[PDB]
Amino acid sequence: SQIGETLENIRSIEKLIQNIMRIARETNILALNATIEAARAGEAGKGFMIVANEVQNLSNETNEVTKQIVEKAREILESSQRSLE
Amino acid sequence: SQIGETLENIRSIEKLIQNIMRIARETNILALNATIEAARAGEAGKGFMIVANEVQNLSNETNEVTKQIVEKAREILESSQRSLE
Amino acid sequence: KEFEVLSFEIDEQALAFDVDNIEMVIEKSDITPVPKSRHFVEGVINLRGRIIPVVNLAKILGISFDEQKMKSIIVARTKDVEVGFLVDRVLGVLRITENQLDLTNVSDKFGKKSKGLVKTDGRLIIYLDIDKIIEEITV
Amino acid sequence: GSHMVPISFVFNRFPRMVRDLAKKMNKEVNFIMRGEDTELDRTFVEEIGEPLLHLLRNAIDHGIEPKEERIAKGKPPIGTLILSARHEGNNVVIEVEDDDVVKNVVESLNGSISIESEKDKGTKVTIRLPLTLAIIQALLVKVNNLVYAIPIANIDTILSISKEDIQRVQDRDVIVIRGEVIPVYRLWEVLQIEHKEELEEMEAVIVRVGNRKYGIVVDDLLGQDDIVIKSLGKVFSEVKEFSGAAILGDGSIALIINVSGIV
């Protein structure tokens, strides 16, 4: 609990926040490599490349804040686990 | 009280990122509708459809993971609540 | 005989045209105003690098209107003319056929504009005719 | 951006299309295209090539008479028509020659195929399609965030006058400069815009027209630049108060003030 709960939590948030940290990397290409290459098919290449762009832009924003979770959440224990001290 | 700061320090992060349930969702819908059109368009440059579905998964992706962080970081409270004691 | 149309409403008023004359859809943005233009025109926008005029569709059929609800711009393409239509929310595809049609061009106002009126299990989806509708905006 | 390419993509469809039009009329007519690399504008791939087929269909049938009426007229036993194409200043002149729905097929994207002729010499044909796409020195002006370009070649001078000089007359306002009188006009007015009122010293631009010149007062002065003027559809063909808009650098759209198109 508490001093342990925190850990039982941080890890519960790490293995998960890392998951989002994963997607951020898969999308960073699963879409970037679909735009920088979308300029091959029909004339809609220039039209699709952009619609595919935004997909990442407002997507990365997740990590921007999502990672801001651990950044602080890790302090919880950093201080609560340290409260053990 | 940093531990007493966890009582909200993250509370913000969670709600600030919560913006995903809306903005991240947004991109999804906007694209999903672009799939309806990209489809009824033609057939030659179908290459824009073979990926117009990418987001359909990229989105439904952060879903199970984001539902996880909210489920997890919410534990800190249940624990810090005892902690604040 | 299978028609593909773009479904969308204009204040509890459904409309739709064949995708044949459709380029894409965008949201009402920086619409540069064109001086001494024509009452039923909003202005011009920069799209893909060309200046496409944004007409006020709803303002043509003398129907409802709302500068606010008007958040969707429908870009068309005639034989060589390109025009955008500012309207409300959009739906998407819709399978049309000689079955959904219920011609009765003797029970309304503006005529030639609409080729007819279709019905989906009991809806207000009105079939428009971009060609003749645009022909009015031109020449 | 490669908007220019040899005429090989809208003029080579003749050394074999003018042949059949000579056999279906029993009238031998030579056909030598004097040049087929006229770098006319690329956007003409569908408004100049084909239209040049109705200027040659009269270069064989409705022109040269058979040997029986040829060697007994004033033309040698063998004629020779020439389908050319060149540049005369800023207008591709892909002419046609030999020895009214088509009056719009070429007039769609600039042009106007005519028919000039004489006796025992043949008829001549020539269209007019500009091949100059690129540079126009313009004066970028602003009015409540409304960038309006002014054709440089039309401007004469940019002088800043005070709201004092003005001396209203029979009606329109004016300013006495160099003994001459210029009918000053407020841009935002002739364009009908919700203006503030009138700042103290306003900057005015003197534009030349025909044989005279009027003054145009504007809000703020951005800066001269080379823009990309482009016909803004027909949905504005009525608004004579302009000529054609254009997309600046940052992406802002800017209309061009057709100097002659303002009271």
Swiss-Prot record, chain C:
Domain CheW-like: 2-139
Gene3D superfamilies for the chain: CheA-289, Domain 4, SH3 Domains
Pfam families reported for this sequence: CheW (PF01584)
SMART domains listed in its UniProt record: CheW
Record's protein name: Chemotaxis protein CheW
Keyword Endoplasmic reticulum found: no
Name of the gene: cheW
Keyword Cytoplasm: yes
Species: Thermotoga maritima (strain ATCC 43589 / DSM 3109 / JCM 10099 / NBRC 100826 / MSB8)
Location of the protein in the cell: Cytoplasm
Main location: cytoplasm
UniProt xrefs under InterPro entries: CheW, CheW-like_dom_sf, CheW-lke_dom
Entry keyword set: Chemotaxis, Cytoplasm
Function recorded in the entry: Involved in the transmission of sensory signals from the chemoreceptors to the flagellar motors.
GO biological process: chemotaxis; signal transduction
Curated annotation (Swiss-Prot), chain D:
Single GO MF annotation: phosphorelay sensor kinase activity
The entry's keywords: ATP-binding, Chemotaxis, Cytoplasm, Kinase, Nucleotide-binding, Phosphoprotein, Transferase, Two-component regulatory system
Gene Ontology terms describing biological process: chemotaxis
Phylogenetic classification of the source organism: Bacteria, Thermotogati, Thermotogota, Thermotogae, Thermotogales
Subcellular location: Cytoplasm
Signal peptide as annotated in the record: none
GO CC annotation, single: cytoplasm
Record domain CheW-like: where: 135-263
Name of the molecule in the record: Chemotaxis protein CheA
Keyword Magnesium set for record: no
Function summary: Involved in the transmission of sensory signals from the chemoreceptors to the flagellar motors. CheA is autophosphorylated; it can transfer its phosphate group to either CheB or CheY.
Keyword Flavoprotein set for record: no
Major site of localization recorded for this protein: cytoplasm
Taxonomic superkingdom: Bacteria
